[PDB]
Amino acid sequence: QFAKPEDAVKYRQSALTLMASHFGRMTPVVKGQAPYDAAQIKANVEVLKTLSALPWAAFGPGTEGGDARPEIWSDAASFKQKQQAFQDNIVKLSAAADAGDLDKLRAAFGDVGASCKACHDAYRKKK
Amino acid sequence: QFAKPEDAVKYRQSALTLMASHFGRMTPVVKGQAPYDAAQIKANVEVLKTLSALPWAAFGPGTEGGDARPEIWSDAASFKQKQQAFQDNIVKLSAAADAGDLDKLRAAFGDVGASCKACHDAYRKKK
Numbered sequence: 532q533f534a535k536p537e538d539a540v541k542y543r544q545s546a547l548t549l550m551a552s553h554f555g556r557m558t559p560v561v562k563g564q565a566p567y568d569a570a571q572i573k574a575n576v577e578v579l580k581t582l583s584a585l586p587w588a589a590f591g592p593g594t595e596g597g598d599a600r601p602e603i604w605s606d607a608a609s610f611k612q613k614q615q616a617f618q619d620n621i622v623k624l625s626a627a628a629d630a631g632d633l634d635k636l637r638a639a640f641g642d643v644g645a646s647c648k649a650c651h652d653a654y655r656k657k658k
Numbered sequence: 659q660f661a662k663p664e665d666a667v668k669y670r671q672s673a674l675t676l677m678a679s680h681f682g683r684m685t686p687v688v689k690g691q692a693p694y695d696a697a698q699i700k701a702n703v704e705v706l707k708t709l710s711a712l713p714w715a716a717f718g719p720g721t722e723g724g725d726a727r728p729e730i731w732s733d734a735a736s737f738k739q740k741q742q743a744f745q746d747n748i749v750k751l752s753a754a755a756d757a758g759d760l761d762k763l764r765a766a767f768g769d770v771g772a773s774c775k776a777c778h779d780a781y782r783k784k785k
């Protein structure tokens with residue numbers, strides 16, 4: 532869907548920006564600093580689930596650019612493992628949110644965050 | 659979920675960027691220049707549906723900025739009518755996509771596009 536590589540870059544950066552907001556806005560809830568409304572969080576994690584599937588298709592071959600490391604394309608199977616693992620961590624968060632289980636939510640949230648960081652450590656250039 | 663107005667601006671611009679991609683990538687399909695796979699389009703319009711609900715919450719009061727016109731906030735009921743109407747046009751597109759009906763899809767796509775433009779004409783500053 533991208534006329535030039537720059538369009539892919541813009542897409543993925545936007546997708547990741549939205550993910551970051553949908554993930555990060557729950558931080559006060561998991562910390563107890565904001566109240567836990569099970570329905571609010573269920574709906575939000577549904578949005579996060581949708582969004583968390585989107586960036587990967589915008590790292591198609593030849594879409595080098597932005598702060599993407601070239602290892603994304605050298606190493607296809609390893610990058611795919613990291614995104615698929617990340618999406619599976621999102622599944623655990625969805626399960627927690629759907630159950631209305633705050634303890635499972637906290638645990639899953641931590642694991643998701645670790646997965647974001649593991650990918651960045653391997654595949655995102657320093658700012 | 660926004661620490662400063664700039665964060666709201668960044669969010670909505672990203673949401674609208676993703677909408678534009680999910681909408682616009684169907685143009686060749688509705689024109690017949692690319693093949694119509696009913697399942698592909700159904701899935702894509704589901705993503706568009708999710709995305710099309712997101713920008714509006716990021717025009718909360720005091721989040722002036724970007725290319726948003728101030729009339730968004732003077733005139734709340736009129737802006738809300740335009741976004742809700744737009745989302746209802748997305749419902750028609752969803753119905754068409756879910757039915758696998760290409761003629762309804764074409765018609766709905768046109769109406770959606772007109773709705774994007776009607777909002778821009780009233781509420782988005784010139785580049």
Ligand code: HEC
Nearest residue numbers: 544547548551554596597598599613614617647650654655
């Ligand atoms: C690889 C499997 C990743 C996972 C999982 C997550 N992120 Fe990431 N992120 C990744 C890359 C390769 C990049 C660079 C993209 C580019 O082309 O520049 C990013 C970037 C971000 C950004 C910055 C986006 C921008 O505005 O330019 C953000 C805010 C971000 N990532 C957040 C984020 C969060 C919160 C994640 C888990 C919920 C997450 N990322 C996972 C690669 C990967």
Ligand code: HEC
Nearest residue numbers: 671674675678681723724725726740741744774777781782
């Ligand atoms: C009002 C009810 C709108 C509807 C419906 C649509 N758009 Fe829009 N758009 C609107 C505003 C007020 C702005 C400015 C946002 C800001 O703070 O700057 C925009 C902007 C866009 C953009 C640019 C985003 C960016 O990268 O800065 C795009 C690509 C865009 N809009 C596309 C778009 C499409 C394709 C729409 C229908 C499917 C659509 N918009 C509807 C207001 C409104």
